[PDB]
A paper describes a structure:
The 14-3-3σ protein, which has multiple interacting partners with specific peptidic motifs, was used as a case study. We have observed this phenomenon first-hand with human 14-3-3σ, a protein which has several hundred known interacting partners in the cell. Furthermore, different isoforms of the 14-3-3 protein are function-specific. For example, the 14-3-3σ isoform (but not other isoforms) specifically targets p53 and is associated with tumour suppression, making it invaluable to determine crystal structures of the target peptide with the correct isoform.
To address this problem, we present a combined co-crystallization and peptide-soaking approach to obtain crystals for any 14-3-3σ–peptide complex that may exhibit difficulties when crystallizing under our optimized ‘sigma’ conditions. The second step involves, after these 14-3-3σ–cJun-pS227 crystals are fully grown, displacement of the c-Jun peptide via addition of the desired peptide for the final structure at high concentration to the crystal drop and incubation for a period of time until full occupancy of the peptide is achieved. We have found useful criteria to be using the peptide at >95% purity and performing the soaking at 277 K with an incubation time of one week. To demonstrate the experimental reliability of the method, we considered this approach for peptides found in the PDB where co-crystal structures were published with isoforms of 14-3-3 other than the sigma isoform, since they were not able to crystallize under the standard ‘sigma’ conditions or any of the other hundreds of screening conditions tested. Not only does this significantly reduce the production time, but new 14-3-3–peptide structures that were previously not accessible with the 14-3-3σ isoform, despite screening hundreds of other different conditions, were now also able to be resolved. The new strategy that we present here has allowed the determination of several new structures of 14-3-3σ which had not previously been possible, illustrating the ease and success of the method. All models were determined to belong to the orthorhombic space group C2221 using Zanuda. In addition, the method retains the robust, stable, high-resolution and well diffracting features of crystals originally grown in the sigma screen.
Residue numbers in the entry:
A (entry chain P), B (entry chain P): 205 to 209
C (entry chain A), D (entry chain A): -4 to 207, 209 to 231
Write the structure that this text describes.
Amino acid sequence: RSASF
Amino acid sequence: RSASF
Amino acid sequence: GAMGSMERASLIQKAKLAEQAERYEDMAAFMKGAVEKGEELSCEERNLLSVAYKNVVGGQRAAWRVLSSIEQKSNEEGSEEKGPEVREYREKVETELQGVCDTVLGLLDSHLIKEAGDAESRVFYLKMKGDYYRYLAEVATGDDKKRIIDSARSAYQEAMDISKKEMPPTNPIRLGLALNFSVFHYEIANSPEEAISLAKTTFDEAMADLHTSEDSYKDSTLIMQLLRDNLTLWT
Amino acid sequence: GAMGSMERASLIQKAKLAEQAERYEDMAAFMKGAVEKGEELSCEERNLLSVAYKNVVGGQRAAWRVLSSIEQKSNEEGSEEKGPEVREYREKVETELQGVCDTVLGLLDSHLIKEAGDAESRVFYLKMKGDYYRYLAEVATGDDKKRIIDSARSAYQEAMDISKKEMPPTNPIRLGLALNFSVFHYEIANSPEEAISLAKTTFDEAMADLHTSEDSYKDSTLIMQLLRDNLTLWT
Ligand SMILES: [Mg+2]
Ligand SMILES: [Mg+2]
Ligand SMILES: [Mg+2]
Ligand SMILES: [Mg+2]
């Protein structure tokens, strides 16, 4: 659920 | 651009 | 082929998982394996077959349109020449799309259509045949484009005759068939007046039949709104 | 392989078309062919490589999660047994995902990383190495899960050391690397406090450097907002 880039 | 189904 | 070793019920179960996972290539291969088991399909299995290939070919058609547009801009005055790469890649996607259409038409011809005796199965498969010849017609340019259009028209017309005799005007398969045949007239056969007449007539006749369940009411009116949407676009 | 006969510039041009067409499988194969030409990649070509495989593996990870969830529900008390089909199909997607990760790691090892001398290229590829070991770690369960996690951690740590020495705190590659290493700590290494400390420190140090163009300001603050978003999620 964490955002990566 | 016409809709089909 | 590769699905020959898997049970029919397992191919169906995995097709439903693939849909949940939005893995439509898997789904179509599973459903192609289930068809090649040789047994007729239930109504639910026909819908899974339809959903899988519609999504596969729908992505290919979207990509083809992006590439065909780039290609056409590349062929205008003042545009710098960029080599054969755009035409090559457009041709690559186009060939893949045609291969999926041929796969579907091949399943319908061997042997889904000839074993379909009920109206609901027979109209469903003939509509599919018309749809996938129509997808071929979208990208056809050579000496077969006329014959592809006529194969689409013939399959749609046969499905229409059966559906008017055998189904009520509100039946979702009958409605969806008339919608797509009207899209064929407008977008493929250069017959926008025939498209509009078909859409208006189909809508009015369904409207007069709605009074005959709330669940079926919702199913029919959903498709009638697509007819309405197109009429608003076309007029 | 299959791209051996095509010019490097043509593979790059077709990779850009495939992106426009949202054909990310094509894009990755084109970019894999361009890498295998043996020349180092420009900054723009590195970004195309990254976009292509991120989208390929991103779809596979999304499907794996849908299937793993169905599988876990299938293994609870009171759930009816449905046969091996869910585990089989989850394993099928999982193996495909691992194959893409191995393909990427293979490109990095042969020979992108050993030829990257500049900070921007070397940190970019080491971050990629960490990301794709992290995607392997998401689905690892056996006796190699510890070693996969440590390969991810090692690549991220090497990239961090270089980026702190060689880049300003606002550099997008440095920011994106720190974001993903913080996601590694939180989601993979069970170190949520290390994740939060890394995210807060990375954000504050970029904030103090923003005063040094409006275009680069927009690039950095975009990634800082992702750090902010995660901090809000995590605390
Ligand atoms: Mg088999
Ligand atoms: Mg008129
Ligand atoms: Mg080749
Ligand atoms: Mg604490």
